[PDB]
Amino acid sequence: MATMDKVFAGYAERQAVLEASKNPLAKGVAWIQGELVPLHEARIPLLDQGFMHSDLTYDVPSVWDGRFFRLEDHLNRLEASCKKMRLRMPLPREEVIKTLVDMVAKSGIRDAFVELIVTRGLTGVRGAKPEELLNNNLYMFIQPYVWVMDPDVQYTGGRAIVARTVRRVPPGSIDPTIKNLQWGDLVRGLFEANDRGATYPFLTDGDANLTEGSGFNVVLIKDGVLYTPDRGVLQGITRKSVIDAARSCGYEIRVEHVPIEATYQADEILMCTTAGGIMPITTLDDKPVKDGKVGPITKAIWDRYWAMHWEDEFSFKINYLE
Amino acid sequence: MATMDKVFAGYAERQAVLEASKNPLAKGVAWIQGELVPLHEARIPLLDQGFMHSDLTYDVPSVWDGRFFRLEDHLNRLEASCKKMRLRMPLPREEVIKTLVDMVAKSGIRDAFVELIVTRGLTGVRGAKPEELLNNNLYMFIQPYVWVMDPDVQYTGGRAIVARTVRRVPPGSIDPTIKNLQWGDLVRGLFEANDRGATYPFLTDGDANLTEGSGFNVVLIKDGVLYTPDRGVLQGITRKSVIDAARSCGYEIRVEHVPIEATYQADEILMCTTAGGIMPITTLDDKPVKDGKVGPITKAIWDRYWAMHWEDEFSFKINYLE
Ligand SMILES: *Cc1c(COP(=O)(O)O)cnc(C)c1O
Ligand SMILES: *Cc1c(COP(=O)(O)O)cnc(C)c1O
């Protein structure tokens, strides 16, 4: 399984079973202070600082065909984000994983979006001593796999703009390697994209370089070489997988500063994210990207990315039997 | 009532009554989808985009001695913030005010922190059509008045640092005139201040100008003239009241770019915010601000700001009798 047709046929088959389910957890499940609740019924304390000041980090691993994909990479990134924020995982890792796998199994969901959120808790940083800020809260949930680009659009590629009315929050305000939900710039980018008849905004760093978009990294392909911005962006696990895939497929990939001009000169463009995978861009600022077709290197990356989902090195099988 | 002793003595007497109250709502009350809930019991949906992507705006008016202070100014600012964010107030203004005054009356709180939050609702911007993003959510709560600087400390002033490890989110990322809860830079500032043995961080715009701090505006006084940053900051209602007070007292106040160097040259420094009022700063970067005492112009502004709380132009009396 890794041509688009094969990957999507498997998804379609599993999705048909899931859409027919009468399981009250089939639309997702949340873990709230040690209790499982259907996702759409889940509630959190008003006073949680994750809401009061978006004072949190989070991470989103995924399950594909009943297999957790790169879960340890996501959990290590979450731990790193927590350390940077002076937060601590409220449960030890074996309990986190045990709980996630139980949630997935109970839901019956085979292709899942999985989110963990660690918040400061009920006491705000403002006016507190460090010792008063150690009771951090954890929220976790799973839901049916989410597509930032629908399967059918991945065949043709999507429409992007380089945002001109907004730029990325600079690392000296918020470190973008700490995964966070402070989406003020990204939401402005989304509205700009919609106003300009596109779906995906690419944000600059306000100094004429490409950064990332609204929840995805961006990779440019130029003369058989892949390029992706180093600074100013989340170091995506999908991006990590694209770096692995490039080397697997025998291409070079450069993680470095990418002048915005390079977007206009690119042979192929793709976006990457856990919620959707490898997402080609074939129109930029209302003009085709080269010939306006999904490029061959993109297709090689696409196939290898998905093939990784069935390899032990990158995934593990969840037991759904209860 | 306008000298510190008199204003704080009134608060202390009301507080003693409030602390002795057995009414569970004396600790605060929230409005959640048309229902009043004790504040610490209040819960919001996990899927609310106000939590999921901090996709919201808010505003914080106040009640002092049973009088709402400049409520219309806060509601107009909240309406202006909503318009900029493509949000709409979920209730008409007469219902908002009626609900807030009912909540205050039920709680018995005479000196109150009041918060209104308007979120995108349960549907995220990413992947939506404009018409799918109109079901916005409202949350409101009141709690006992919050002090960003305690009354006793206001006599002698607090310790600030100019932040060096973080700068303010630029307006080209997030417009700081839209009041918001995306505090990543402000929380970084709070941690830096605590690491450096201070309480209040002043953030620069990353281009050697003063902006604001973690939930307060900053006003410098130099040779009898007041100065406060124009760009890069929330246009505070307390700041508005300081502008009013300055003119009332016969001082000039300039709202303009304030090079960071001016902070070090200032005769007096104050912070201003709804949650605590007029808060003198007497130590900056471990050095006294001039003689290290609360200055005379600060004290004039202080008294006038508080006197405005009993004037009909700026306040209205809540009826607590049921
Ligand atoms: C999560 C995220 C991405 C993609 O990261 P993955 O680990 O590939 O899912 C890209 N940009 C931003 C801003 C993000 O928060
Ligand atoms: C609310 C706020 C202030 C102070 O505004 P007031 O209207 O005086 O309460 C200052 N800075 C920031 C960043 C704020 O959100």
JSON list of C-alpha atoms in Angstrom, two decimals, chain A residues 30 32 39-48 50-56 58 85-86 115 117 119-120 125-130 133 139-141 143 146-149 165-175 180-188 190-192 194-195 199-200 214, chain B residues 30 32-33 39-40 42-48 50-56 58 85-86 115 117 119-120 125-130 133 139-141 143 146-149 165-175 180-188 190-192 194-195 199-200 214:
[
{"chain": "A", "resi": 30, "resn": "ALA", "atom": "CA", "xyz": [-11.54, 12.65, 25.30]},
{"chain": "A", "resi": 32, "resn": "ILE", "atom": "CA", "xyz": [-10.52, 14.66, 31.14]},
{"chain": "A", "resi": 39, "resn": "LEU", "atom": "CA", "xyz": [-15.51, 13.97, 22.27]},
{"chain": "A", "resi": 40, "resn": "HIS", "atom": "CA", "xyz": [-18.45, 16.27, 21.54]},
{"chain": "A", "resi": 41, "resn": "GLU", "atom": "CA", "xyz": [-19.52, 16.12, 25.19]},
{"chain": "A", "resi": 42, "resn": "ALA", "atom": "CA", "xyz": [-16.08, 16.88, 26.62]},
{"chain": "A", "resi": 43, "resn": "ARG", "atom": "CA", "xyz": [-15.66, 19.99, 28.81]},
{"chain": "A", "resi": 44, "resn": "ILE", "atom": "CA", "xyz": [-12.68, 21.68, 30.53]},
{"chain": "A", "resi": 45, "resn": "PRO", "atom": "CA", "xyz": [-12.53, 24.15, 33.51]},
{"chain": "A", "resi": 46, "resn": "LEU", "atom": "CA", "xyz": [-13.20, 27.77, 32.46]},
{"chain": "A", "resi": 47, "resn": "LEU", "atom": "CA", "xyz": [-10.31, 28.83, 34.69]},
{"chain": "A", "resi": 48, "resn": "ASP", "atom": "CA", "xyz": [-7.77, 26.51, 33.05]},
{"chain": "A", "resi": 50, "resn": "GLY", "atom": "CA", "xyz": [-4.79, 26.82, 28.64]},
{"chain": "A", "resi": 51, "resn": "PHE", "atom": "CA", "xyz": [-8.01, 28.73, 27.96]},
{"chain": "A", "resi": 52, "resn": "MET", "atom": "CA", "xyz": [-7.44, 31.88, 30.09]},
{"chain": "A", "resi": 53, "resn": "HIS", "atom": "CA", "xyz": [-4.03, 32.71, 28.47]},
{"chain": "A", "resi": 54, "resn": "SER", "atom": "CA", "xyz": [-3.47, 29.93, 25.90]},
{"chain": "A", "resi": 55, "resn": "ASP", "atom": "CA", "xyz": [-0.70, 28.96, 28.28]},
{"chain": "A", "resi": 56, "resn": "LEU", "atom": "CA", "xyz": [-0.04, 25.49, 26.93]},
{"chain": "A", "resi": 58, "resn": "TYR", "atom": "CA", "xyz": [0.36, 20.38, 22.56]},
{"chain": "A", "resi": 85, "resn": "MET", "atom": "CA", "xyz": [7.75, 26.26, 28.78]},
{"chain": "A", "resi": 86, "resn": "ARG", "atom": "CA", "xyz": [8.55, 25.13, 32.33]},
{"chain": "A", "resi": 115, "resn": "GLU", "atom": "CA", "xyz": [-4.05, 15.31, 20.38]},
{"chain": "A", "resi": 117, "resn": "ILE", "atom": "CA", "xyz": [-2.43, 19.24, 25.46]},
{"chain": "A", "resi": 119, "resn": "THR", "atom": "CA", "xyz": [-1.55, 23.46, 30.16]},
{"chain": "A", "resi": 120, "resn": "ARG", "atom": "CA", "xyz": [-0.17, 25.56, 33.03]},
{"chain": "A", "resi": 125, "resn": "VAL", "atom": "CA", "xyz": [1.93, 32.73, 35.84]},
{"chain": "A", "resi": 126, "resn": "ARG", "atom": "CA", "xyz": [1.14, 36.43, 36.47]},
{"chain": "A", "resi": 127, "resn": "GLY", "atom": "CA", "xyz": [1.61, 37.11, 40.19]},
{"chain": "A", "resi": 128, "resn": "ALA", "atom": "CA", "xyz": [2.76, 33.57, 41.07]},
{"chain": "A", "resi": 129, "resn": "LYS", "atom": "CA", "xyz": [5.95, 32.11, 42.53]},
{"chain": "A", "resi": 130, "resn": "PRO", "atom": "CA", "xyz": [7.54, 29.25, 40.50]},
{"chain": "A", "resi": 133, "resn": "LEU", "atom": "CA", "xyz": [2.96, 26.76, 38.98]},
{"chain": "A", "resi": 139, "resn": "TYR", "atom": "CA", "xyz": [-6.04, 16.86, 28.11]},
{"chain": "A", "resi": 140, "resn": "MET", "atom": "CA", "xyz": [-6.03, 14.17, 25.46]},
{"chain": "A", "resi": 141, "resn": "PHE", "atom": "CA", "xyz": [-8.39, 13.26, 22.66]},
{"chain": "A", "resi": 143, "resn": "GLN", "atom": "CA", "xyz": [-11.05, 11.91, 16.60]},
{"chain": "A", "resi": 146, "resn": "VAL", "atom": "CA", "xyz": [-8.55, 15.12, 9.74]},
{"chain": "A", "resi": 147, "resn": "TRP", "atom": "CA", "xyz": [-7.57, 16.24, 6.21]},
{"chain": "A", "resi": 148, "resn": "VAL", "atom": "CA", "xyz": [-5.99, 19.68, 5.78]},
{"chain": "A", "resi": 149, "resn": "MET", "atom": "CA", "xyz": [-6.20, 18.69, 2.08]},
{"chain": "A", "resi": 165, "resn": "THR", "atom": "CA", "xyz": [-1.27, 41.35, 5.05]},
{"chain": "A", "resi": 166, "resn": "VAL", "atom": "CA", "xyz": [0.23, 39.26, 7.88]},
{"chain": "A", "resi": 167, "resn": "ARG", "atom": "CA", "xyz": [3.63, 37.75, 8.77]},
{"chain": "A", "resi": 168, "resn": "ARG", "atom": "CA", "xyz": [4.71, 34.90, 11.08]},
{"chain": "A", "resi": 169, "resn": "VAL", "atom": "CA", "xyz": [5.11, 35.59, 14.79]},
{"chain": "A", "resi": 170, "resn": "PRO", "atom": "CA", "xyz": [8.92, 35.94, 15.20]},
{"chain": "A", "resi": 171, "resn": "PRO", "atom": "CA", "xyz": [10.82, 33.45, 17.37]},
{"chain": "A", "resi": 172, "resn": "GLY", "atom": "CA", "xyz": [11.88, 36.28, 19.74]},
{"chain": "A", "resi": 173, "resn": "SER", "atom": "CA", "xyz": [8.18, 36.65, 20.68]},
{"chain": "A", "resi": 174, "resn": "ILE", "atom": "CA", "xyz": [7.11, 32.97, 20.63]},
{"chain": "A", "resi": 175, "resn": "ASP", "atom": "CA", "xyz": [9.53, 30.14, 19.79]},
{"chain": "A", "resi": 180, "resn": "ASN", "atom": "CA", "xyz": [1.32, 26.03, 20.39]},
{"chain": "A", "resi": 181, "resn": "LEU", "atom": "CA", "xyz": [-2.30, 27.09, 19.82]},
{"chain": "A", "resi": 182, "resn": "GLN", "atom": "CA", "xyz": [-1.68, 30.85, 19.61]},
{"chain": "A", "resi": 183, "resn": "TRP", "atom": "CA", "xyz": [-2.89, 31.03, 16.05]},
{"chain": "A", "resi": 184, "resn": "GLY", "atom": "CA", "xyz": [-3.53, 34.81, 15.69]},
{"chain": "A", "resi": 185, "resn": "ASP", "atom": "CA", "xyz": [-1.24, 35.18, 12.64]},
{"chain": "A", "resi": 186, "resn": "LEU", "atom": "CA", "xyz": [-2.26, 31.83, 11.14]},
{"chain": "A", "resi": 187, "resn": "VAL", "atom": "CA", "xyz": [-5.96, 32.66, 11.34]},
{"chain": "A", "resi": 188, "resn": "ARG", "atom": "CA", "xyz": [-5.31, 36.09, 9.73]},
{"chain": "A", "resi": 190, "resn": "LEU", "atom": "CA", "xyz": [-6.44, 31.82, 6.51]},
{"chain": "A", "resi": 191, "resn": "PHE", "atom": "CA", "xyz": [-8.86, 34.74, 6.11]},
{"chain": "A", "resi": 192, "resn": "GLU", "atom": "CA", "xyz": [-6.43, 36.40, 3.69]},
{"chain": "A", "resi": 194, "resn": "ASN", "atom": "CA", "xyz": [-9.98, 32.91, 1.55]},
{"chain": "A", "resi": 195, "resn": "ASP", "atom": "CA", "xyz": [-10.39, 36.62, 0.57]},
{"chain": "A", "resi": 199, "resn": "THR", "atom": "CA", "xyz": [-7.08, 27.79, 0.66]},
{"chain": "A", "resi": 200, "resn": "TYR", "atom": "CA", "xyz": [-3.49, 27.84, 2.02]},
{"chain": "A", "resi": 214, "resn": "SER", "atom": "CA", "xyz": [-1.51, 27.63, 9.01]},
{"chain": "B", "resi": 30, "resn": "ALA", "atom": "CA", "xyz": [-19.84, 32.56, 35.29]},
{"chain": "B", "resi": 32, "resn": "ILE", "atom": "CA", "xyz": [-22.19, 29.55, 30.32]},
{"chain": "B", "resi": 33, "resn": "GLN", "atom": "CA", "xyz": [-24.73, 29.13, 27.50]},
{"chain": "B", "resi": 39, "resn": "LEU", "atom": "CA", "xyz": [-16.94, 30.37, 38.94]},
{"chain": "B", "resi": 40, "resn": "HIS", "atom": "CA", "xyz": [-14.77, 27.48, 40.11]},
{"chain": "B", "resi": 42, "resn": "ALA", "atom": "CA", "xyz": [-17.65, 26.54, 35.37]},
{"chain": "B", "resi": 43, "resn": "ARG", "atom": "CA", "xyz": [-16.76, 24.44, 32.31]},
{"chain": "B", "resi": 44, "resn": "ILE", "atom": "CA", "xyz": [-16.55, 25.15, 28.57]},
{"chain": "B", "resi": 45, "resn": "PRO", "atom": "CA", "xyz": [-16.61, 22.70, 25.61]},
{"chain": "B", "resi": 46, "resn": "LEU", "atom": "CA", "xyz": [-13.20, 21.19, 24.85]},
{"chain": "B", "resi": 47, "resn": "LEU", "atom": "CA", "xyz": [-13.88, 21.78, 21.12]},
{"chain": "B", "resi": 48, "resn": "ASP", "atom": "CA", "xyz": [-14.49, 25.51, 21.54]},
{"chain": "B", "resi": 50, "resn": "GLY", "atom": "CA", "xyz": [-11.35, 29.77, 21.97]},
{"chain": "B", "resi": 51, "resn": "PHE", "atom": "CA", "xyz": [-9.47, 26.88, 23.57]},
{"chain": "B", "resi": 52, "resn": "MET", "atom": "CA", "xyz": [-8.50, 24.90, 20.43]},
{"chain": "B", "resi": 53, "resn": "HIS", "atom": "CA", "xyz": [-6.80, 27.89, 18.67]},
{"chain": "B", "resi": 54, "resn": "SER", "atom": "CA", "xyz": [-7.20, 30.79, 21.16]},
{"chain": "B", "resi": 55, "resn": "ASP", "atom": "CA", "xyz": [-9.48, 32.12, 18.42]},
{"chain": "B", "resi": 56, "resn": "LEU", "atom": "CA", "xyz": [-11.21, 34.79, 20.45]},
{"chain": "B", "resi": 58, "resn": "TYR", "atom": "CA", "xyz": [-12.12, 39.52, 25.23]},
{"chain": "B", "resi": 85, "resn": "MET", "atom": "CA", "xyz": [-11.74, 39.42, 13.96]},
{"chain": "B", "resi": 86, "resn": "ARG", "atom": "CA", "xyz": [-14.92, 38.75, 11.92]},
{"chain": "B", "resi": 115, "resn": "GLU", "atom": "CA", "xyz": [-14.57, 39.41, 31.90]},
{"chain": "B", "resi": 117, "resn": "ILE", "atom": "CA", "xyz": [-14.98, 36.44, 25.99]},
{"chain": "B", "resi": 119, "resn": "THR", "atom": "CA", "xyz": [-14.83, 32.97, 20.63]},
{"chain": "B", "resi": 120, "resn": "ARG", "atom": "CA", "xyz": [-15.12, 31.68, 17.07]},
{"chain": "B", "resi": 125, "resn": "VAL", "atom": "CA", "xyz": [-11.58, 28.79, 10.53]},
{"chain": "B", "resi": 126, "resn": "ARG", "atom": "CA", "xyz": [-9.22, 26.28, 8.89]},
{"chain": "B", "resi": 127, "resn": "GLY", "atom": "CA", "xyz": [-11.10, 24.53, 6.08]},
{"chain": "B", "resi": 128, "resn": "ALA", "atom": "CA", "xyz": [-14.35, 26.50, 6.56]},
{"chain": "B", "resi": 129, "resn": "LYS", "atom": "CA", "xyz": [-16.46, 28.77, 4.34]},
{"chain": "B", "resi": 130, "resn": "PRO", "atom": "CA", "xyz": [-17.23, 32.23, 5.82]},
{"chain": "B", "resi": 133, "resn": "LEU", "atom": "CA", "xyz": [-18.13, 30.63, 11.01]},
{"chain": "B", "resi": 139, "resn": "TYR", "atom": "CA", "xyz": [-18.56, 33.43, 28.04]},
{"chain": "B", "resi": 140, "resn": "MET", "atom": "CA", "xyz": [-18.77, 35.94, 30.86]},
{"chain": "B", "resi": 141, "resn": "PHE", "atom": "CA", "xyz": [-17.63, 35.87, 34.46]},
{"chain": "B", "resi": 143, "resn": "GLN", "atom": "CA", "xyz": [-14.75, 37.46, 40.39]},
{"chain": "B", "resi": 146, "resn": "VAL", "atom": "CA", "xyz": [-7.78, 41.40, 40.99]},
{"chain": "B", "resi": 147, "resn": "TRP", "atom": "CA", "xyz": [-4.61, 43.40, 41.87]},
{"chain": "B", "resi": 148, "resn": "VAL", "atom": "CA", "xyz": [-1.68, 43.31, 39.46]},
{"chain": "B", "resi": 149, "resn": "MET", "atom": "CA", "xyz": [-0.06, 45.39, 42.21]},
{"chain": "B", "resi": 165, "resn": "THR", "atom": "CA", "xyz": [15.08, 37.68, 26.02]},
{"chain": "B", "resi": 166, "resn": "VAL", "atom": "CA", "xyz": [11.70, 38.36, 24.35]},
{"chain": "B", "resi": 167, "resn": "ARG", "atom": "CA", "xyz": [9.99, 41.18, 22.44]},
{"chain": "B", "resi": 168, "resn": "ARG", "atom": "CA", "xyz": [6.35, 42.08, 21.79]},
{"chain": "B", "resi": 169, "resn": "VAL", "atom": "CA", "xyz": [4.42, 40.23, 19.06]},
{"chain": "B", "resi": 170, "resn": "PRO", "atom": "CA", "xyz": [4.46, 42.75, 16.16]},
{"chain": "B", "resi": 171, "resn": "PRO", "atom": "CA", "xyz": [1.17, 44.21, 14.92]},
{"chain": "B", "resi": 172, "resn": "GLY", "atom": "CA", "xyz": [1.83, 42.60, 11.53]},
{"chain": "B", "resi": 173, "resn": "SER", "atom": "CA", "xyz": [1.41, 39.22, 13.26]},
{"chain": "B", "resi": 174, "resn": "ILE", "atom": "CA", "xyz": [-1.33, 40.04, 15.76]},
{"chain": "B", "resi": 175, "resn": "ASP", "atom": "CA", "xyz": [-2.90, 43.51, 16.02]},
{"chain": "B", "resi": 180, "resn": "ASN", "atom": "CA", "xyz": [-6.49, 38.81, 23.07]},
{"chain": "B", "resi": 181, "resn": "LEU", "atom": "CA", "xyz": [-5.37, 35.91, 25.23]},
{"chain": "B", "resi": 182, "resn": "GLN", "atom": "CA", "xyz": [-2.40, 34.83, 23.16]},
{"chain": "B", "resi": 183, "resn": "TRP", "atom": "CA", "xyz": [0.14, 35.61, 25.86]},
{"chain": "B", "resi": 184, "resn": "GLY", "atom": "CA", "xyz": [3.19, 33.64, 24.70]},
{"chain": "B", "resi": 185, "resn": "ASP", "atom": "CA", "xyz": [5.49, 36.68, 24.69]},
{"chain": "B", "resi": 186, "resn": "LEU", "atom": "CA", "xyz": [3.94, 38.14, 27.85]},
{"chain": "B", "resi": 187, "resn": "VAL", "atom": "CA", "xyz": [4.39, 34.87, 29.78]},
{"chain": "B", "resi": 188, "resn": "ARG", "atom": "CA", "xyz": [8.03, 34.75, 28.55]},
{"chain": "B", "resi": 190, "resn": "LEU", "atom": "CA", "xyz": [6.89, 37.23, 33.28]},
{"chain": "B", "resi": 191, "resn": "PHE", "atom": "CA", "xyz": [9.37, 34.36, 33.59]},
{"chain": "B", "resi": 192, "resn": "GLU", "atom": "CA", "xyz": [12.29, 36.64, 32.60]},
{"chain": "B", "resi": 194, "resn": "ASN", "atom": "CA", "xyz": [11.00, 36.51, 37.87]},
{"chain": "B", "resi": 195, "resn": "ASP", "atom": "CA", "xyz": [14.41, 35.10, 36.82]},
{"chain": "B", "resi": 199, "resn": "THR", "atom": "CA", "xyz": [7.78, 41.44, 39.04]},
{"chain": "B", "resi": 200, "resn": "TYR", "atom": "CA", "xyz": [6.94, 43.49, 35.92]},
{"chain": "B", "resi": 214, "resn": "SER", "atom": "CA", "xyz": [2.17, 41.58, 30.67]}
]
